[PDB]
Design a binder for this molecule. Structure first.
Ligand SMILES: O=C(O)[C@@H]1CSCN1
Lengths: 275, 281, 267, 279
C-alpha cells in the first residue's frame, strides 16, 4: 500500500529503486524520484522500470509515505528548507546523505512541524543486485514501528540491522566504502592474472567469482576468517607463498587504514553538517 | 543436457577439497551421497567424520575407490600423485575419467604414468577452489590427449553445479591457481583486516565481520552482473570529496594494487616450481 | 571587440587567440622575454597599465597573485561600465577583486578563470566562474573566446582550486613525465631526440584516444596489455612504486596550495 | 609519394591491434574497408564484431588472408608467429610484403622460417601503438634483408597516415616498445589516477577525466611543437612559491621519474625475454 520517494537520482537512489523493484516488495508505480538535472540515461532507465519521475521535489513529498534523501551532504539543508513545509505527520524521512546527523535534520524540520520522524541510513550500491549491507539509526520522534518498516524495507535488498547513530561513521568506512575497495582489488587481481598469462575477461571473471565465493563461505560459516585462511593454505604451497608477499607489503594494515580514513572523513562531514 | 544421475564418483584423498566438492555436489542434487566414495591415508580427520555423516562411503584402500567410481577425482598433494598413479595404475579401466586437482601436476605427467598400464587413459586436469562447498566455486579444466568430447562436456556440467566452470588450455591453469585457486585466502585475509578496521573505529567484532563480508559479496556480484569495467564501478561509487575517495587514496599510497599482483604472481610461480621439482625427481 | 593583458600566460593567450583568428592581433594591448615575441605578432605593447584599461573591453589580469591588489588600486578608477575584468591569477578570489573594484564603481563585472599554457597551441583546459555582477552574456562571451584555444566550461568558484591541481598544474606533470620517459628510452639505447618525440606522441595519442572514447581509462589500459606481455610487466613496476598515489598527492598538493594563496588574497 | 590505394591489406590476428590499424587506415581514407581482410582463431571477440560493421572481410582461414593480400600484417601473439609462418609460408608469393608487429620477434627469425619455402621474403618489422585508432599513433619500422627500396617508403607512407612514423635500426625496436609501445598504458593509468585526485579535491568524475586528458594532450602537443627541453617547459609553468612547484615536489619525493624509467626498462626487458624464449 505504502509509497516511497527519492529526493535525488544519483547512483545510490537508482540502486535502491532498482533493488526495490527487483524485490517486488512494492510496485514501481509506488516509487517517485525527483532530480532537477536527471540524465536521460537515468530517466529512461527509471521510466522503463515504471518509476514515476518529476523535477519538483515537492511532488515527491506529496506522493510519498517514506522519503529517501539521497543527495550530496551539503545539498541537504537546502532540500529541507524547500520541502520542510510539506512534511506531514505521516512522513518518514530516511536520510542517506553521508555524515548528515539526525540532529541536523530534526533541527531543520522542527522549524515547521514539531515531531519529524527521521531515520538515518548507511547503505551501499550492491542493493542494486539485492546484496547490500545497510544499517539505520532511529531518531527522536521515529515511532517503534518506523524502525521495523525501515528494517523490512531494506532487508529485501541485502543485510540490514539497527545500530546506534554513533557507529554509522564506522559502518561507512567498512561496508559503505567497502565496495570501492573490492572493485580496486578485483581490478588489481585481474592485472595479476593478465601478468601471468590469463585473458583480461577471464581474469576479471575468475577474481570476482573467487571473492564472492569466499565472502559467501564466511557468511555461512561459524569459523574465524583466519581459520578459513588456514584451511586453504597447504604446507609449502602456492597460497601460503602468496600470503607471505601480501604480509610483507602490510596488506592488512592498508585495509585498516582505509576503513579508518573513510570513517574519519565521514566525521569531518558530520561536523560541517552540525556547524 | 547429459544424463549422469546413475554415475559414481570417487575421491583419492579425503581432505578439504574432497569434502568441499562432495558437499557442493550433494547440495546441488546432481550426486547421491552414497554414489560417492573417498579414500584417505588416515581416518582420524574431521573431514572424514563429516563425509561419513554426509552419507559418503569411506575406505582406506585407494584401489577400492577406483573400482567403485566412474569419475575419479585425485585430490592429494602434488608429490603424492605419481605414487597414487603407481598404486592404482593397473586398476584403471577404459570407463574411467581421471580428474586431477593437484596444483601444478601436468596432464602429460599423469598420462605418462598411467600409459605404462593401459594405453589411452582419459585424463582431465582442473583447478577449483573451496567455495564449491557453498556452490560458488571458480573452476577451470583442460582435457587430456585421450579425453573424449563428451568427457569435457560431462566434466563442465558436473562442476558448473557448484560454481563458475569453463575450459582452458592447460598452460593457463598455473595462472588460474594464483588467481581463483589462492583467491579465497586473499579474501579471508582481507576480511580479517577490514574487520580489525571496523573494530578500531568502534564496531562490535561480529558486526564488523558480517558487514565486510556482505560488502565484498555484494560488490563481487555487482561486477559479475555488470557489463562495466571494475574501474567504472569504483568511479560510480566515489562521490567528490567523499569518504570513499579518501580511503581509496590511502590504499594507493600503500601500493594496495601491486600487493595483489604480487600475490597472484607468487602463487603462480610457486605452482610452476612445485611441478619442476616434481618432474626433476 | 577589444582585449587587453596586464607573463608566460599573457603571451600564451594572445598567441592562441590570434592563431584562432578570433581577434585581430592589433585589437590586443599588453603591459621581458615575452616582449620581443609579442611585438613580432603585431600586438600593441604599452608600459602603462592605465593605457591597457582605456583601450580594452575584456581585461585579462595575468600577474602574480599578490600583485593583483596593487593593479586594482591603480586601474580601479579607470574601470568603466563596459569592462569585463577576467582574473587568471592563481588563488585570487572573485570576492577579493570585487572588494577592491567596488570602492570605485559599484557593479564591477568580474570573471575568474583557471587556464593553462597549452592555450599557446590551442589545446588548453579552461574553467571559469562568473562574478556577482557579471551578466549571463559575459559568461557566454568568455566561453566563446576561450573555447577558441582549447576546452572551456563554467564551474562554481569553489571548484577552481581543484581544477588548478588537475589541469592548471597538469602540463608540468606531463613535462616531468616525458623527461623521465625519455631518460628511460635513452637508458634502453634510444637517441634522446627520438625518445622525446616518441614519448610525447605516445602521451598525446593516449590522451586523444580517451577524449574520443566512451570508455573508462582502465578499459583502454586493458586493451594495451597482452597477457604475459611487456606492457603488463611495466604496469606492475609502476604499481609497486605507488605511481597512482603520487599523481593523487600532486593534484591534492596543488589544490591545497591554491587555497593557501586564496587565504593570503582574502587576508 | 607512392600510389597504393588499390592494394589489399591483410591482418593475421583480428585482435586489438588489427582493429586499431584497420580503424585508423579507413578513417584516414588511405584504404577502403572492403580491401581489408583479417583472420582470427576466435570470432567471438568484441573487436571481431567491430571489424564486421566496418566492412572488413573476416575469415577463420589464415590461408585466405594471405592469398587476398599484398601487404600482410602479423598481429598475432609473439610465441605463435612460428606456427603461423609454417602454416602460410608456402602461400607467400613474390608480391608480398610481410609486416610483423609482434613485440620482440626479430626479422631474422621471420626470414629464417620463410626462407624455407621461397627465398628473398620481403619482411618489415614495426612497433606501433593503439592511438593509430585516432590517427595519432607512434610507429617505428625496420626493413629486412630482401625488402626493396620502395617497400620501406610504402611502409612509411601507409603508417604516417595514422600517426608519427620513422625508420629505425632493428636493435632500437625493443626500447621503442617499452617507451611508445607500452606508453599509452602508462598514460591511461596516469589519467585514471589524476581523475581520482580531481575527485578527491571535489570535482565531478567526468569533469576530472576530461580536464586531466586535455591537460596531457596539450602538454604533449606543446612539447612536440616547441624546440624546447621538457625541463625548460616545466620551468616556464612553475611560478615561484606556486601550486605547481608544490605538486612537483610531492612527485619528486615519491621518485615519480624513476618509476617511469623503471617502466620503460621493464617493458623493454620483457620484450627481449619473449624473443629469447622463442629462440
Ligand atoms: O604488452 C604488450 O605486449 C603490447 C605489445 S607491445 C606493447 N603493448
Amino acid at each position: 500500500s505504502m509509497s516511497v520517494g527519492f529526493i535525488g537520482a544519483g547512483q545510490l537512489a537508482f540502486a535502491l529503486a532498482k533493488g526495490f523493484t527487483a524485490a517486488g516488495v512494492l510496485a514501481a508505480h509506488k516509487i517517485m524520484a525527483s532530480s532537477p538535472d536527471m540524465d536521460l540515461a537515468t530517466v529512461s532507465a527509471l521510466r522503463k522500470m515504471g518509476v514515476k519521475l518529476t523535477p519538483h521535489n515537492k511532488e515527491t513529498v506529496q506522493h510519498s509515505d517514506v522519503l529517501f534523501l539521497a543527495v550530496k551532504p551539503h545539498i541537504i539543508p537546502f532540500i529541507l528548507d524547500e520541502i520542510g513545509a510539506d512534511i506531514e505527520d505521516r512522513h518518514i524521512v530516511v536520510s542517506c546523505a553521508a555524515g548528515v546527523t539526525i540532529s541536523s535534520i530534526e533541527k531543520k524540520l522542527s522549524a515547521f512541524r514539531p515531531a519529524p520522524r527521521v531515520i538515518r541510513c548507511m547503505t551501499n550500491t550492491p542493493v542494486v543486485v539485492r546484496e547490500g549491507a545497510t544499517v539505520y539509526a532511529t531518531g527522536t520522534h521515529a515511532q517503534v514501528e518506523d524502525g521495523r518498516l525501515m528494517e523490512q524495507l531494506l532487508s529485501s535488498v541485502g543485510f540490514c540491522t539497527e545500530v546506534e547513530e554513533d557507529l554509522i561513521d564506522a559502518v561507512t568506512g567498512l561496508s559503505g566504502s567497502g565496495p570501492a575497495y573490492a572493485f580496486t582489488a578485483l581490478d588489481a587481481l585481474a592485472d595479476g592474472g593478465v601478468k601471468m598469462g590469463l585473458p583480461r575477461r577471464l581474469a576479471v571473471r575468475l577474481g570476482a567469482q573467487a571473492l564472492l565465493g569466499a565472502a559467501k563461505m564466511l557468511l555461512h560459516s561459524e569459523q574465524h576468517p583466519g581459520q578459513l585462511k588456514d584451511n586453504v593454505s597447504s604446507p609449502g604451497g602456492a597460497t601460503i607463498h602468496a600470503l607471505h608477499v601480501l604480509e610483507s607489503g602490510g596488506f592488512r594494515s592498508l585495509l585498516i587504514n582505509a576503513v579508518e580514513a573513510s570513517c574519519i572523513r565521514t566525521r569531518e562531514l558530520q561536523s560541517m553538517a552540525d556547524q
